[PDB]
Paper text:
[name] is found in the biosynthetic gene cluster of the antibiotic viridogrisein and catalyzes methyl transfer to the C3 (i.e., β) position of α-ketoleucine (4-methyl-2-oxovalerate). The overall structure consists of a two-domain fold that assembles into homodimer in both the solution and the crystal. The N-terminal domain (I6 through H147) consists of helices that mediate dimerization, while the C-terminal domain (F149 through H338) consists of a Rossman fold. A single metal ion is located at the base of the C-terminal domain and is ligated by H244 and H296.
In order to provide further insights into the broader substrate scope and enhanced total turnover number of SgvMVAV, we determined its crystal structure in complex with SAH and 1a (2.04 Å resolution). Protein crystallography showed that although the three amino acid substitutions led to limited alterations in the overall structure, they resulted in a substantially widening of the binding pocket to accommodate larger substrates. Meanwhile, interactions between the protein, the metal ion and the bound SAH cofactor are sufficient to accommodate these dramatic changes in the active site contours with minimal perturbations to the overall scaffold. Taken together, the expanded substrate binding pocket and the retained overall enzyme scaffold allowed for a broad range of substrates to be effectively transformed, leading to a generally useful enantioselective alkylation biocatalyst. Further active site engineering showed that a single [name] mutation significantly improved enzyme activity (TTN = 1080). M144 resides in an α-helix proximal to the phenyl group of 1a. Ultimately, triple mutant [name] [name] [name] [name] (SgvMVAV) exhibited the highest activity, furnishing excellent yield and enantiomeric ratio (e.r.) of 1a (TTN = 1,410, 93% yield and 99:1 e.r.). Compared to wt [name], SgvMVAV provided a 235-fold improvement in TTN, demonstrating its substantially enhanced catalytic efficiency.
Author numbering:
A (entry chain A), B (entry chain A): 4 to 338
Write the structure that this text describes.
């Protein structure tokens, strides 16, 4: 009875916040694949009758899920068939983003590393990531750890036209357009799955007519820059690396094109990841992002120095790097 | 520059320990599937030359993985081709256990919930869990959150024979046998994949000749109790529920058989999960364990009361329940 109590206290300390985070991540990924999570908000209610119908789910099954999440403490039952997210839901979801990204989006790397180590080319085409999961997990991380700084920079200098390259689910644009009343946005992304997710999200935010989703590669922009011109700000979050080190020249043409297409006041903003940081706070997640990129995707992440170097030798001036909350995340501003 | 710093501090607080945990879980699951993690220990070294050969991996690929984990802060490079785990590695691995269990072992439930909601029978046979992942993730959680109390109870009363039903990777037995010099163990488990993992682990701990792994169902024990008799302690961790509510009678025969086969001093110890706790600490992970069991596996988790009730109406006396560190985990001792 003594040592049971001691084993209890010691175990609770060892486990720390991991039980809570493991449970939230699983409930939220499952609910997001169902389409339920888009209906969860601490300030709005989810009416099961309508949502079950909208999502084409048996209402009873939705109720059993929601009751499970209610037991977990992630939602509150407001009345019969009405639920709302717990007050700290957005932070819970943000943290789940990291877990979803490493454990869900990048699962093919985790499961099939042996293949990647022995025959990379065969592995790379056999074990492919689900870009809907890449884009969503990225959005959950972004909400609190990389969107806010870029949002605030974009909001000042009050743009009329914003282009986001490799936009994923288009959350940053939805946010920009929400904050500056007379703005248009174009979100560009190579993945059908991301684009479908985005169009849905954009519609859900009532901006379908203000914010266009165009399914194209960023490479496209080098030869067909007929999407940039008019833009006060061009943004690119975690995409530029997708053409390094293999398409260096294309990258430099996209950069040259960006410089041109800009209104005379505006800027390019690049959110991207720098490789293998050593500082205590950033190092562990930095290493995961770097290893997935380096080893599995064979994309080159550049250092701060290299990025600054490149934006200059692309004809941008006043280029600086800002530290983001997401480990090894950096914001580059090039005017 | 002001608001970048403010967005930084706010983002770091929002993210909390999630970046670190997400990265550790992914590195460790990946490394455990490779067979590397069994070689990681804060007190021993991993010699890449031998391990790469033992694991049938290109040594250079192992080195690149280990260097990534070193950058992450999870291993320390001792010299060329020598590495050891960071000092707090066991706690890191324990926490990764929770993430692995919810996000890896139970992945088929996360990805295919829609199917489970619409046609359960078809879903249950189409989307099946990898029991090697179930057993390993369970072991990582157990290390600090459910093995210690059962270990300490077993170690007292110094047994000669211990049987563990649904033993997974047999860590509890390996630990019991390690602490009481003249003990034999039998670990029983229905999953080939778990048994293979176990035999390997048992061999790695030099107990192959002391600890037998028998691939059988727990149901087996109802009709063929020729595995129990002689036992000072019978243990069963997170298996009993696998015959409820459908094989109630079989469960009661296994229980009756257990009562008989015991030496006159010994006891049955059951580690198992109670459903949907409400207390703040346990509720969130409790709900995940309960929802996976209830909804996806259709196994009945019993409350403390029900379990105590059952162990009595099986002819055990002096039955009590102890709180474990793993949320909604309970240890039942029946003599
Ligand atoms: N060559 C390419 N051209 C355009 N988009 C690309 C690309 N390679 C990858 N992408 C997209 O880039 C995104 C990377 S992650 C999502 C990033 C998003 N801007 C955000 O910050 O939340 C994915 O949506 C992926 O589909
Ligand atoms: N009907 C059954 N008979 C025997 N073992 C079973 C079973 N159903 C599931 N199992 C096994 O029970 C285990 C549940 S999880 C692992 C539990 C292990 N005792 C531990 O505490 O770490 C798995 O190894 C699974 O393969
Ligand atoms: O997945 C990719 O391809 C990326 O570029 C990852 C983008 C990212 C970076 C940090 C946290 C979450 C998401
Ligand atoms: O996966 C199963 O079937 C189980 O019974 C899970 C056993 C378990 C319980 C709590 C944490 C980790 C593992
Ligand atoms: Zn990337
Ligand atoms: Zn179970």
């Amino acid at each position: 009875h003594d040592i049971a109590a001691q084993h209890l206290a010691d175990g609770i300390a060892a486990s720390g916040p991991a039980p809570d985070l493991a449970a939230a991540a699983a409930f939220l990924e499952m609910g997001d694949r169902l389409g339920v999570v888009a209906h969860l908000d601490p300030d709005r209610t989810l009416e099961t009758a309508e949502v079950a119908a909208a999502l084409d789910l048996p209402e009873p099954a939705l109720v059993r899920y929601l009751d499970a999440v209610e037991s977990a403490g992630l939602v509150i039952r407001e009345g019969e068939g009405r639920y709302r997210a717990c007050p700290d839901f957005d932070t819970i979801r943000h943290q789940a983003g990291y877990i979803s990204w490493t454990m869900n989006a990048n699962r093919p790397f985790i499961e099939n590393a042996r293949d990647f180590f022995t025959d990379w080319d065969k592995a790379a085409r056999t074990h492919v990531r689900d870009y809907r999961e890449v884009a969503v997990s990225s959005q959950w991380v972004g909400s609190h750890a990389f969107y806010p700084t870029a949002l605030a920079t974009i909001i000042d200098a009050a743009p009329r036209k914003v282009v986001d390259l490799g936009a994923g689910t288009c959350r940053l644009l939805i946010e920009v357009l929400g904050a500056v009343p007379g703005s248009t946005g174009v979100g560009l992304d190579f993945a059908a799955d991301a684009c479908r997710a985005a169009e849905q999200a954009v519609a859900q935010a009532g901006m379908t007519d203000r914010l266009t989703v165009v399914e194209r590669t960023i490479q496209s922009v080098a030869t067909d820059p007929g999407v940039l011109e008019g833009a006060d700000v061009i943004h690119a979050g975690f995409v530029f690396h997708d053409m390094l080190p293999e398409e260096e020249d294309v990258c430099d043409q996209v950069l040259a094109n960006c410089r041109e297409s800009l209104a005379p006041g505006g800027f390019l903003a690049i959110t991207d990841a720098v490789p293998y940081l050593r500082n205590d706070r950033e190092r562990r997640f930095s290493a995961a992002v770097s290893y997935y990129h380096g080893e599995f995707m064979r994309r080159r992440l550049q250092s701060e120095e290299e990025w600054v170097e490149r934006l200059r030798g692309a004809g941008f001036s006043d280029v600086r790097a800002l530290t983001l909350a997401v480990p090894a995340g950096r914001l580059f501003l090039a005017h």
